[PDB]
Symmetry: C3
């Protein structure tokens, strides 16, 4: 699981370290993924650059998760639900201000540790 | 849909307010999406960081669109053609200098407004 | 193909001209692409913004490749292998510090040069 997090710089920079902890804790609980392998990329953006609907507040945050094919529908749905529940409880970002997107690809589309993902 | 737009800072920064309006106009027109749900992220790059082929002018722009699976092939194809037509017309960006990429995923791959995309 | 390259600023900025060369060489070799058609976007990142596991070093680099569907698995695996080999030889980025991700979509999901990708 590679995670990219996008948000307005003034709201996201003060929450970065905590948001990262909460995200990884959810990933580990929902997907049983090693505690060690936190791979997060944060993109604090200016207001001119990150545009969203009038409906949302300045706390509007996008979380993009990429991972190898093969986890169950149940496990992904649980990841989403955990992230909404703990990010609101722990960081105060309401459900309306939070967007989550999971992307998959076959194992041989990945490379790491010197070899293909299908090995 | 979620839209990300990449281009050279010096070309993209003066055009971004009107590029965003035009992109959304095409999204509304081809996908019957609500006029209110405009979700755009711009990424003006330094010239050292965006490298393209000599076949492209400094206007070269990349538009990446992510949406839930389910739309027809014909609607997605309409969205592409409309974006080419109207960005040419409204902004002067020729078709050779514009690249568009659509990405889909199942609905349960999305979370928004506190519930999954289902 | 479209290529995005992420890495910590202190490592990526000095190396991105050579890394762009080496990447393009491997793409042309594994996919018989033209020697033109190099499309590369670099994202030199702050270490507060690109977090990775403790066993990785500051040379940790992510290469994201977007391409039209239709290439064989053998060609995509060759591309992965060539990138691990030539980037390690040319820039000294060890296999554990290099991560590669290919993403595909139907040809009609693309536009370039004013036409749809399936035209």
């Amino acid at each position: 699981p590679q995670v990219k997090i996008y948000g307005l710089d003034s709201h996201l920079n003060p929450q970065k370290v905590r948001l990262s902890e909460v995200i990884h804790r959810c990933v580990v609980e929902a997907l049983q993924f090693p505690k060690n392998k936190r791979f997060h990329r944060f993109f604090p953006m200016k207001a001119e650059d990150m545009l969203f609907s009038e409906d949302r507040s300045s706390a509007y945050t996008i979380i993009e998760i990429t991972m190898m094919e093969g986890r169950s529908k149940e496990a992904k749905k649980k990841l989403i639900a955990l992230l909404f529940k703990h990010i609101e409880e722990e960081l105060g970002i309401a459900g309306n201000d939070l967007e989550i997107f999971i992307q998959e690809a076959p194992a041989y589309h990945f490379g790491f540790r010197g070899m293909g993902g299908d090995e």
